[PDB]
Symmetry: D2
Subunit: 203 residues, 4 copies
């Protein structure tokens, strides 16, 4: 099947200023995300080579390379369209109602998501996801790209808390980055994903 590819940004590289700089968007998308695409394709290619030669002695390496890079690729693929120069404000419609039901209010959702974002020790993400078993909205606090999450959980809104996502602009003051993020959230994009996710069940 077709290899992974780097998706293009769906807005100008400087479209998210003054909240996320064009300097960051260029490095983050063009360099960091590109590396995951290559790493994910390479992990699959190397696993196919291992199977074909009958030597799976490096399986642990290949499986971590696969998880790390595929997770990085999935996470950034969702992240870019989650942002918009026409973003901000609050979720509406069925997504807004579901957030009120799952978290109490938009304010409480935001406070929980923000606390999950700033609490990470090392690299990671705060995400809103749909649990396909319970058929419900949850927040997950990812470690690196591929840890601290349940299988099947379907990503809806991502916030990258790796230092490369904010350091050039905000230095160590990551809370100011988290606050800025709310200005650029593309709730229409999150709503489309929610429509897709709600059709998925574990079985």
């Amino acid at each position: 099947s077709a290899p992974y590819t780097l998706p293009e940004l769906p807005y100008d590289y400087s479209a998210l200023e003054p909240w996320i700089s064009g300097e960051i968007m260029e490095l983050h998308h063009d360099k960091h995300h590109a590396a995951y695409v290559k790493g994910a394709n390479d992990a699959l290619e190397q696993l196919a080579e291992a199977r074909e030669k009958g030597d799976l002695s490096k399986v642990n390496l290949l499986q971590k390379n696969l998880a790390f890079n595929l997770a990085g690729h999935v996470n950034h693929t969702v992240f870019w369209p989650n942002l918009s120069p026409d973003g901000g404000d609050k979720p509406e419609g069925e997504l807004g109602a579901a957030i009120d039901d799952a978290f109490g209010s938009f304010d409480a959702f935001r406070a929980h998501f923000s606390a999950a974002a700033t609490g990470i020790q090392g690299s990671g993400w705060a995400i809103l996801a749909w649990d396909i078993l319970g058929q419900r909205l949850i927040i997950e606090q990812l470690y690196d790209h591929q840890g601290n999450l349940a299988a099947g959980s379907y990503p809806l809104l991502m916030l990258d808390m790796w230092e490369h996502a904010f350091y050039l602009q905000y230095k160590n003051v990551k809370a100011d980055y988290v606050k800025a993020f709310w200005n650029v959230v593309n709730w229409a994009d999150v709503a489309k994903r929610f429509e897709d996710a709600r059709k998925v069940a574990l079985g």
Copy 2:
């Protein structure tokens, strides 16, 4: 929405002998899985309490408790019907063809899955999953319940490599447990999940 519950086993507790003992099935399902159900419901209840009282200072604890227990619950929910007293043999139909295409052959799939299973350092799982971004079959080697995996990946076939899943019968000789597992795989169940998973895309 409705709380998580413990699913019943879909066969007799001793149905998988001599491959997995009834002694293990009873403890593993009735005690271990029950604990994840309670832990997952409790994590959500405690997160709701934290939001309502405006104190998210324990978010890191609650988010790991959620990930660990929800992942445990998802993983075992898929695991039980993945096994059957009428299991064994090989995948057929579109699932069999997809495994041949993704892994080269059933033998190569089995060798890769087995190597992933025995290579774990600590607790974990070998799983066959559908990557919802690439629309393709992959193996993932999970750490504990909730690590070393990509968001969205949809579980199809699980092998629990926590020591509680095999120690009473096989002691330290986990390779013999992995070999025994192939005798009880419910390929019809895996095929149904694959039919469900193939309808899911990241977007």
Copy 3:
């Protein structure tokens, strides 16, 4: 440098009964610890080969194999002499006084240590250690063998909470294993370790 070797047990397999079975002690020492010794020697051999042949692209694998196996070897090397058929009771002398100072009382230390032991999510350890920077006693809750700890911290008392350490005897009821453990702690060994540790500083 000389290869790592498996230390002998300082007592007969059954010497810790009824608290820890001879059945477990034999498997645990003769099979599990032996595998970490081999794994640690193999990791060093493979690192030397990778340096010599130019294969340091495998470094992440080889360094995880080294950490996991060397940590397992270290941890079990401390564990066996930490137990004794003539143990139990309480720490005395300077060790007893330091535990009182650091934790409040022996009973409070036991409550904290026991909570760290039973709380592990996955495989791990509860340990008492000397922090060589702060020159003070701490508990550390290790993940697997090699996670959740500070460099230099010097192990004094170990409790193995991997399921292989207790499952055959206590099944899922790890609190009963932890309760049993206190009857076999070799406080004289812990005290010797403490004397050695207090001479170590980070500098």
Copy 4:
């Protein structure tokens, strides 16, 4: 016991230019290291409170906060004096001879160390350490601050590969940061640490 404190830098912020910028050194030491000092003291205070008030159900959180922050404090405490404006060149004397014996040559040590540094998937460190069991030099590739290492191993030379350590200057090009690092290694400091380490045994 006395609370942890932030050690002063042994040189001016800009003393490592052009290899590591004063801009980074100031943020890194004055903001990031300060936070680990506070976090480590806070973790110990919160553990004492949990013991006293009966709240050890929070033990997993408090022990992760302790490990993460104490490890960060340890690691940076070693890092600053490991660097010098009068460094670079090569290890000599007994340290140089031991590196030749353990790694083949200084050049082979540098290749291994550099591969461990650039290979990290997430935040972490490459370190040279003394294994207090085997009485030998090893490299360890730390995850975050507190992962992928063996208890007791005594740190000699640290390279911080968290993105905050290099991003403002080197952006995503971490190989150029690692190349730069060799020009500022304080081999006299590493040699002192090695003298101290060789007197430590696991026992």
